[PDB]
Amino acid sequence: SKEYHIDEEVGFALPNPQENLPDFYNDWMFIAKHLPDLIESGQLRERVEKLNMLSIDHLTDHKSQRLARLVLGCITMAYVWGKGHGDVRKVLPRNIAVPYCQLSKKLELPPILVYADCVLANWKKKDPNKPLTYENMDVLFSFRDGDCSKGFFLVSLLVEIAAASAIKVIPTVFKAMQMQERDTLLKALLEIASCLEKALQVFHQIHDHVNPKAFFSVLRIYLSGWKGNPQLSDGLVYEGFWEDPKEFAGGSAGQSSVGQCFDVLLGIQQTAGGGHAAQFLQDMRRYMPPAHRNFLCSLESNPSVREFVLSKGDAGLREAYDACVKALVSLRSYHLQIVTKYILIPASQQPKLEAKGTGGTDLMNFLKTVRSTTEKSLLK
Ligand code: HEM
Ligand SMILES: N[C@@H](Cc1c[nH]c2ccccc12)C(=O)O
Ligand SMILES: N[C@@H](Cc1c[nH]c2ccccc12)C(=O)O
Ligand SMILES: [C-]#N
């Protein structure tokens, strides 16, 4: 939390991000706040084209810059894909592309919508006095009518917030290890285990608030990017800023720092091996914010928790360590059931070889590999 930008309450998410931008950027905000109206009519592309270029000099604080990144991101997805039928643009106008790339270079992120934009910085609460919950929360931006983006982004965000309770315990783990405190370390790991068990129960909410057929058909194509995607094979041309088409992967909770945090914390070597699964999870750290990228680096630059627990010859300590790994295996085993209900079954129903995700991976091969690596890390 010191320099890593991690909150006790909300976790990796942005605590109370801005809703309104400054008065200078009202032209972007009007396109963002009315994305379903402009895109359904079929008048979005002409409005983005007919819009004079603007500088990014008047964005003082950090919260404004990520709001503008979310705004510019949502328009860029909505411009490229459009109706979600097939008609797409290989080139983005220089009036929006240049300020977005300059803003992207400043925040050290790529010029595309990412998990940090559409989940972590895309929320408010209705009544500030009430706590964090779906009934007292709402998104800032949506793509279409009946896309279930409110239910989607908040249920993703609420599971991120569930893991916040575990992230604050990590300083206790490494303090207990270097000072040789068995009881502190055992209780700290069980707390992390219980917190990750609670995050799975928050996942269950997704069935209530997100419809499968709505999600797959309309929302999923807006979250999709242009890295190894048949529609934009060479990539997306950022006119003015760049020379050629540049490939950039779509949004995914692969870009969440929570997923990769507890694998690194528990010594689950996902990023090792150099396979197609390991190659993806390392690449997605460049799609995370710079502060959370440093946090994962910080956890890797610490003594191994796995090696410590194995050395001690302690049943209770291994058991507490396994509780964390079993919690990750449960979350991943449930996440596959979501993928079956929200991708596989919807994909078979639509009319006219392995399926590609929004991030670009062979999802069924990728997720089962990543879950398998987690399960092998169990002790006895
Ligand atoms: C309708 C809901 C969801 C669907 C359809 C879905 C689908 C997928 C797919 C296809 C991937 C593979 C990467 C890619 O996009 O190419 C993936 C990865 C991932 N998803 Fe989800 N997902 C959903 C919700 C969630 C939620 C709510 C979380 C966490 C709060 C989550 C965490 C992850 C993580 C961490 C990865 C990276 C691989 C891993 O660590 O297991 N997903 N997801
Ligand atoms: N990222 C999830 C926890 C998690 C870790 N690995 C996962 C794999 C799939 C789904 C979720 C997870 C959270 O915020 O609590
Ligand atoms: N990767 C998912 C989409 C997805 C799930 N959670 C996300 C969070 C942010 C951006 C995209 C997503 C898919 O292929 O269907
Ligand atoms: C989940 N992407």
Numbering used by the authors: 12 to 363, 374 to 401
Quote the authors verbatim.
hIDO1 is a heme-containing enzyme that catalyzes the first and rate-limiting step of the kynurenine pathway—the dioxygenation of Trp to N-formyl kynurenine (NFK). It negatively regulates cellular immune response via depleting Trp and promoting the accumulation of kynurenine pathway metabolites. Here we report the structures of the wild-type hIDO1 in complex with Trp, an inhibitor (epacadostat), and/or an effector (IDE), as well as comparable structures of an active site mutant, F270G.
We next crystallized the F270G-CN-Trp complex in the presence and absence of IDE, and solved their structures at a resolution of 2.69 and 3.03 Å, respectively. Remarkably, in the absence of IDE, electron density associated with Trp is evident in the Si site. It demonstrates that the Si site can indeed accommodate a second Trp, offering molecular explanation for the substrate inhibition behavior of the enzyme. The F270G data show that the Trp bound in the Si site adopts a unique conformation with respect to IDE. Specifically, its indole group flips 180°, such that the ammonium and carboxylate groups point away from the proprionate-6 group of the heme. The carboxylate and ammonium groups are in position to H-bond with E171/S267/G270 and V170, respectively, although their relatively weak density indicates that these potential H-bonding interactions are not strong. Although both the IDE complex and the two Trp-bound complex of the F270G mutant exhibit impeded enzyme activity, their structures are surprisingly similar to that of the wild-type complex, except that the heme is more planar and that the protein matrix is more flexible, in particular in the regions near the JK-LoopC, the K-Helix and D-Helix, as exemplified by the ability of the R231 sidechain to adopt two conformations in the IDE complex.
